[PDB]
């Protein structure tokens, strides 16, 4: 399904890339997107897939676009256009200066101060989940750890019942990697339908959970509205149930296939934090964008008001121009460059919580299960979208090679 080429788009810039089903997906999602960085591909191309839109292929352009919110607005951040138009989460769908006031409040429920407060619970849950799997000698990492670890921590922070995970998780997945049963707009409404009654309930009987803090919060000295609160909590649910969950699987998949890298972290534990950064670069997984506020000449390309442009956060770090031998994983990499957590005024506010969950996972898993690998004959399949992920990751190991402690 290719949309008719717009009149202002030259044919030499056409590259029909499908962000929801890249043709080289079987080789790994990151490898599939990297095709946009081959020698014969321009720095900015137009794809006729998913309604038609621009795609910045190099970190230089991606960073520049994210810094220039006057021309590249977050008002319509998702492709396809229907999704981007329906997208109204706060503060991701806002541009400065109005965005800032809301970002401050959001930082209050996911900022570093909140991570320090969860420090104990994060550490405890990781050890508990891993210790329970250790004696089994096998696991389906995606649903046995990757999901429950980050999600239970989020559900506790938001004061929501763990039994609501299945439903909420399904909805958020439809917003980033839709299966076709629900449009972005339908998933958003379902999400709001779930939150509306909860927000009102907590505005009446204020609690200490993230939702209560947002619902009874203030934005630059004035009371937040129920509508605004709803839009903020919606974003929280999505950011709490998708990114970290998927990134942990890309990292564990890599460790399972690389006995040498596991040994390195076992013999030199002080490199874990640095390894986390190298993995964040190599297995970057987000790709959203912006909409043009007006006609604008960008790097020799004529963009028209209303045009959508995908600015893959994932591609900056894979750009050979930013990191030599980009597909190569080296924990000793001197200057690790990437935009995995975004760039510009929307720079991820939960990155401190994400790094903590990643580092804790690396340490506590290798400490107990230093030896493991992909299940016999298993073929790990990835899925592409606004947030890419791993469909399943069956792992196996010899229980006698593990250490309970
Ligand atoms: C490894 C996982 C993570 C990655 C790769 C990631 C990535 C991103 C990126 C690329 C953006 C900016 C998107 C844009 O410019 O439109 C973003 C925004 C944001 N992230 Fe994360 N994130 C991660 C984890 C988290 C977690 C755990 C939380 C908190 C529960 C969180 C909360 C947020 C919030 C609130 C924003 C919006 C800030 C704003 O729009 O001003 N993120 N994230
Ligand atoms: C593209 C994103 C990672 C960013 C934070 C969560 C996400 C899925 C959004 O809807 C905005
Ligand atoms: C952030 N997700
Ligand atoms: K919108």
DSSP string, 264-323: HHHH-GGGHHHHHHHHHHHT--B-EEEEESS-EEETTEEE-TT-EEEE-HHHHTT-TTTS
Resolution for the entry shown, Å: 1.9
Write the DSSP symbol of residue 43: S
339 touches ligand 1 (CB under 6 Å): no
CATH number at residue 71: 1.10.630.10
Q: Is the Cβ–Cβ distance between 184 and 82 less than 8 Å?
A: yes
Active site (catalytic) residues: 177, 242-243, 348-350
Cis peptide before 338 (omega within 30 of 0): no
> What Cα–Cα distance (Å) separates residue 336 from each residue in 33, 229, 330, 331?
19, 36, 10, 9
Question: Measured in angstroms, how far is the CA atom of residue 201 from the centroid of ligand 1?
Answer: 27
Q: Which atom of ligand 2 is nearest to the CA of 348?
A: 5
- Counted domains in the chain: 1
Structural domain containing residue 125: 1-405
| Closest residue by CA, ligand 1 atom 29 | 350
Q: Is the Cβ–Cβ distance between 157 and 114 less than 8 Å?
A: yes
Q: How far apart are CA 72 and CA 401, in angstroms?
A: 53
Label residues 253-270 b or e (16+ Cβ within 10 Å = b): bbbbeeeebbebbeeeee
Question: Cβ–Cβ contacts within 10 Å for residue 272, how many?
Answer: 18
Order of all β-strands in the sheet with 373-374 = 138-140, 394-396, 373-374
Pairing of strands 53-56, 308-311: parallel
Experimental method, per PDB record? X-ray
Q: Is the Cβ–Cβ distance between 398 and 137 less than 8 Å?
A: yes
User: Read out DSSP for 228-268?
Assistant: HHHHHHHHHHHHHHSHHHHHHHHHHHHHHH-HHHHHHHHH-
Q: How far apart are CA 127 and CA 322, in angstroms?
A: 36
Question: Cβ–Cβ contacts within 10 Å for residue 306, how many?
Answer: 12
92 touches ligand 2 (CB under 6 Å): yes
Query: Which of 372, 357, 395 is CA-nearest to residue 124?
Result: 357
Question: Measured in angstroms, how far is the CA atom of residue 267 from the centroid of ligand 2?
Answer: 36
- H-type helices in 16-97, by residue range? 29-33, 59-67, 81-86
Q: Is the Cβ–Cβ distance between 141 and 393 less than 8 Å?
A: yes
| Closest residue by CA, ligand 1 atom 6 | 341
Tokens encoding 211:
């939702």
Q: Is the Cβ–Cβ distance between 99 and 131 less than 8 Å?
A: no
Question: Measured in angstroms, how far is the CA atom of residue 92 from the centroid of ligand 4?
Answer: 10
Q: How far apart are CA 376 and CA 96, in angstroms?
A: 51
Tokens encoding 297:
């000449």
Query: Which residue(s) pair with 47 in the sheet?
Result: 53
Establish whether 348 is an annotated binding residue: yes
Question: Cβ–Cβ contacts within 10 Å for residue 41, how many?
Answer: 16
């Amino acid at each position: 399904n290719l949309a008719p080429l717009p009149p202002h788009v030259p044919e030499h810039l056409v590259f029909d890339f499908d962000m929801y089903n890249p043709s080289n997906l079987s080789a790994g999602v990151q490898e599939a997107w990297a095709v946009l960085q081959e020698s014969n591909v321009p720095d900015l191309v137009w794809t006729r897939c998913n309604g038609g839109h621009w795609i910045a292929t190099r970190g230089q352009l991606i960073r520049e676009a994210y810094e220039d919110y006057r021309h590249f607005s977050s008002e319509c951040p998702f492709i396809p256009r229907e999704a981007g138009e329906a997208y109204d989460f706060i503060p991701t769908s806002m541009d400065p200066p109005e965005q800032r006031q809301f970002r401050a409040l959001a930082n209050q429920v996911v900022g570093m101060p909140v991570v320090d407060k969860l420090e104990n619970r994060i550490q405890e849950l990781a050890c508990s989940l891993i210790e329970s799997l250790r004696p089994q000698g096998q696991c389906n990492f995606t649903e046995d750890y990757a999901e429950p670890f980050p999600i239970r921590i989020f559900m506790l922070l938001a004061g929501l019942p763990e039994e609501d995970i299945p439903h909420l998780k399904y909805l958020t997945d439809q917003m980033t990697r839709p299966d076709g049963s629900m449009t972005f707009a339908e998933a958003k409404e379902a999400l709001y339908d779930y939150l509306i009654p909860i927000i009102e309930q907590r505005r009446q009987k204020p609690g200490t959970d993230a939702i209560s803090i947002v619902a009874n919060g203030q934005v630059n000295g004035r009371p937040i509205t129920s509508d605004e609160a709803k839009r903020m909590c919606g974003l929280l649910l999505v950011v709490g149930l998708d990114t970290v969950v998927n990134f942990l699987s890309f990292s564990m998949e890599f460790l399972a296939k690389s006995p040498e890298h596991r040994q390195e972290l076992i013999e030199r534990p002080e490199r874990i934090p640095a390894a986390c950064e190298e993995l964040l670069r190599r297995f970057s997984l987000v790709a959203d964008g912006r909409i043009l506020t007006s006609d604008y000449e960008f790097h020799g390309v004529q963009l028209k008001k209303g045009d959508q442009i995908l600015l893959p956060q994932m591609l900056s770090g894979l750009d050979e121009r930013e990191n030599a031998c980009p597909m190569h994983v080296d924990f000793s990499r001197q200057k690790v460059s990437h935009t995995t957590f975004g760039h510009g005024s929307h720079l991820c506010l939960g990155q401190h919580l994400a790094r903590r969950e990643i580092i804790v996972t690396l340490k506590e898993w290798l400490t107990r299960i230093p030896d493991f690998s992909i299940a016999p004959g298993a073929q790990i399949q990835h899925k592409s979208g606004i947030v890419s992920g791993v469909q399943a990751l069956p792992l196996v190991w010899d229980p006698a090679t593990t250490k309970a402690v």
